[PDB]
Structures are given as C-alpha cells and as structure tokens.
C-alpha cells in the first residue's frame, strides 16, 4: 500500500510510554480471524483468565542480530515466550506468575528493528505452531507465510507487530512439556548495509502474551513463585 | 580479599562436555562482572566469555560461541562454564577472573584471577 501503509504503522501503547513505530512492514494482522474463540469446548468458559499488566508489558525480549551477512535461508527459534521466560528473561512478576495451570496464550508480539533508510533485505518472521523444528529442509521456509507473517523491511520501517492467538486445539495446556506458539523471526533474504544507514541491526523481540487463561487455581499472584512441576 | 577458587576441569574425550566452576570471595560478587579466560599450551591468553552482574547480558568469543554457556549462581557466588562440543583447540588452562568498571566508564579491568583448572580434550 500506501507507504506509512494503513495496516502498517502502527502504535502500541501502555505505562508509561507511548512507543511509536515507523511501522509494521505488515502487519502479521489477524486473517481469517480464527482464534479458535476464547471460549471453546474446552473452556467451559470455566477457566481462570488474566489479562493482567504484567503480561501485556511486554516480552520484551531481545532478539537475534541479523546482519547483511546471514542468508538466505535461515531459521529461528521459537520464542514459545513462556518457555523463554522460564528459561530466561523470566518476566519478578513473571517469575511469580510461572511459579501455574495450563495457559491460554495469545501473543501479542512486537518486533522492532532499525538500521536506517540505507538498509534493505527483509526478514520473514513466522507463526508455526508446536515446533517439530529442524533448521534444514528449506522446504519449511518455503511453506511458510501460511502462519502469522508480518515482515521486516529495513528500507521501509522500524517496528513489526505480529499477533498470535492460540494454537493447540487443547484450548489449554501444560507448559513444561508442550510448546504452543513458536514464533519464528527469520530472514528470507538478508540486509545489506551501504554507508548511508545505521551500523546496527540489533533485533528486539517484544511480545506482548495476551489474554492468557490458566485453569487451576493455585496460587497466581504478581510475584512469582509457586509451584509449577 | 578476593579468593577465586576453581574446580571441575579434567581430561575429556572430544565431543565431550565439561562444567567448570569458580567460586568467589571477599568482594560483592553480584555487582561485578566476571569472565572466563583460557591459556593454551604454546599460546597466550584468550578471553572466552563474560557475564554481567545479574546474570544478564553475556558475551562470548566466536570460537566458543554455541558450544560454551556461562551462568552465575549469585546466591552462592559461583561462576559456571558449560563446555559442550569439546575439540582439542579447547585444551587449556581455564581461569576465572573478576572485572570492574571503576567509576562511570566503559572499561572493565580485571583485578583478580583464580588459580587455573586444566581441560585436556584428548
């Protein structure tokens, strides 16, 4: 579209900052809008839901630096994001949260990268579900855009938002064993930096983990710790 | 008074994995950044990895990258190196070391080394 594109640009705001893009590549937006539904079979509509400040803050994760130089031809990890948090980032409120019941997780993801007008070569991000995950067989790379694919254009934007609802028909899951959304942020083609651009694509991966359901009561507080496995 | 005590190194097969440990004393460990540097027979010193305070950002050398993992336990003031994917180029005497940034600059000078643990990957 019209650059600066509608679906594009974009804005995510909460405490206590407005953070404004140049804009989401595109958007990996919401398609045929199939969530399955927040309540499905599964939740009786029974389930314990959240939607509390810590998760919607951010994943605020750090992302992998892509350079001119990887190609083309590249995967990513999954950033299961709760998995990420449990291993790393942990987001004290997050630690307390992790310390619960099967979760109902949507994403809601932001990826911000900025080299400068000088840089060109996108990175194709992907939404594939529970990850069988092997880096070879580029056929997988060919096979997605089918799952949430927003896009990064150094030459056209500094911020990508990829939202993801919830996979796993199970409508709620056990975390230490399973992995719901794996959001891959990969390059299809690589960035190449001429002099008139910024010397740095440090990737950042923000998520936003939205509307997460949990099904036992336990104790869930905004500290973290308790009693998972 | 800084005492950095290192265990865990021993002879290992190639493709093996070791876990080195280094324990610290006599300084506020959890404020300081910490690095592992190694020393190959017939070679000078190479900085391998360092970890930052909270166990936050860590950096590695390109040789060591995905094979070695650095982790701190601040509750027991200990430093860990998990060496996966061992190759003979990794044979060395490994030292733990403690760096400081001084006042408000960006350089991190080492102020204390440990004694050395040997890793023979052969």
């Amino acid at each position: 579209a019209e650059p600066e594109n509608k679906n594009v640009v974009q804005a995510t705001t909460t405490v206590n900052t407005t953070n404004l893009t140049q804009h989401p590549s595109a958007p990996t937006m919401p398609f045929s809008p199939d969530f399955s539904n927040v309540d499905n079979f599964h939740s009786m509509a029974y389930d314990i839901t959240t939607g509390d400040k810590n998760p919607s803050k951010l994943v605020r994760l750090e992302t992998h630096e892509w350079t001119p130089s990887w190609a083309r031809g590249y995967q990513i990890t999954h950033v299961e994001l709760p998995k990420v948090f449990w291993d790393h980032q942990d987001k004290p409120a997050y630690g307390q949260s992790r310390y619960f019941a099967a979760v109902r997780c949507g994403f809601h993801f932001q990826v911000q990268v900025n080299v400068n007008q000088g840089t060109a070569g996108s990175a194709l991000v992907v939404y594939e579900p529970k990850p069988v995950v092997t880096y070879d067989s580029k056929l997988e790379f060919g096979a997605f855009t089918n799952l949430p694919h927003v896009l990064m254009n150094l030459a056209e934007t500094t911020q990508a938002d990829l939202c993801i609802p919830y996979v796993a028909d199970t409508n709620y899951v056990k975390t230490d064993s399973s992995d719901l959304g794996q959001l891959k942020v990969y390059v299809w083609t690589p960035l190449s930096i001429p002099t008139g651009s910024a010397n740095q694509v440090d990737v950042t991966i923000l998520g936003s983990l939205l509307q997460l359901d949990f099904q036992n009561p336990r104790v869930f507080a905004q500290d973290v710790n308790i009693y998972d496995n | 008074e800084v005492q950095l005590l290192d265990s865990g190194g021993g002879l290992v097969q190639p493709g093996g994995s070791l876990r080195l440990s280094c324990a610290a004393s006599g300084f506020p460990f959890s404020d300081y950044a910490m690095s592992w540097i190694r020393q190959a027979p017939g070679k000078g010193l190479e900085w391998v990895s360092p970890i930052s305070g909270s166990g936050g950002r860590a950096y590695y050398a390109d040789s060591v990258k995905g094979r070695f993992t650095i982790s701190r336990d601040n509750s027991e003031g200990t430093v860990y190196l998990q060496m996966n994917s061992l190759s003979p180029d990794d044979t060395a005497l490994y030292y733990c070391a403690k760096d400081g940034s001084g006042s408000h600059y960006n350089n991190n000078y080492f102020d204390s080394w440990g004694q050395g643990t040997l890793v023979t990957v052969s």
Partner: protein, 183 residues
Amino acid sequence: DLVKIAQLFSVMADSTTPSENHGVDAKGYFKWSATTAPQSIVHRNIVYLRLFPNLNVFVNSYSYFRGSLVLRLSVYASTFNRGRLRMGFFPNATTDSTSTLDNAIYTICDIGSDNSFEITIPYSFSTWMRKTNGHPIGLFQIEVLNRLTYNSSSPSEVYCIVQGKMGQDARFFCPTGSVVTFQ
C-alpha cells in the same frame, strides 16, 4: 478447506533458481539486478501442478479441476533499490515468448512501496480439468525489463518472491494419493 492451504496465497518453487543455494530458499524470487539492457530475458518458469512443492501434494491428492491460478509478486526493494519488471505470467502453454506472453493475462507493476501485484493465470484449457501427467501444464514467464534504480545504494541486487493462488473455483475434484503420508 484444503483450498485455503493450496490457496492462501502461497509462494512458489517455481523453477530451480540459480542458487546461492538461495534459490531453494527463494523460492518465490527471480533475481533483480541491473542490467545491460533491460529488455533481456532472464526467465522462463514452467508451471505444474505436479512440480514445485506446495503445488505437488495438492495435485497428487486430486487429479481434476476446479481453479484459476493467481500469481501475485512481492518485492524486497529498498529506498535505494528499486526495479520493474513485467511478468507474463502465462497461461497454459503457449507461445513461450515475448509479445505472445505480453498478449497474455497481464499486470503492470511499479515496485516501489506497493509490495504486491496480482498476475493471475487462468487455465485456458480445452477441458475443465487437466489430469496429472508428465509433459507440462504450461509456462509462466517473467521479464525483468528495467532494473533497479537508485541510491549509493543497496546491494545492487533486488529479489522478488512470487505468490500463487486460484479462484475462482476453489474446489476440486477426485482425491488421490497425497503426496504426504504413511505407510
């Protein structure tokens, strides 16, 4: 339905891609470089149903028609690179050629921020269905015309990924052995 999957605008081999090997990768991508002249041919992609991978499983799992064939391209240009081609991009198995192809289905694209085109190929074929057999359903040709135009700039090369879709008909017919599966 199966159709969204075949359907939901997929990306394509198309051909084997003089690879980097970026050309698996690619797939969707012909190359966009500057050029000594602009009109010269750089591509000639053959379409079936069989061949290029996403098309393959679907095609084996059925052996008739309903459909159309939409190929919509996207571009990774920069400020700094730009580009234009025209793509045929060809039904069924004609002329193999310049003008004949231009005479074909048609799209004219600007590759600036638009980042998407619709070149849709129809099966213009004597019968509603073509079955899965070896010789060819027919060619899709691309012509890159004018390169890229520029800056300082962007490393020179620019690439496109082609997109594939059919309507109108979404729905086919006759199921048959699907490429994926067990034994």
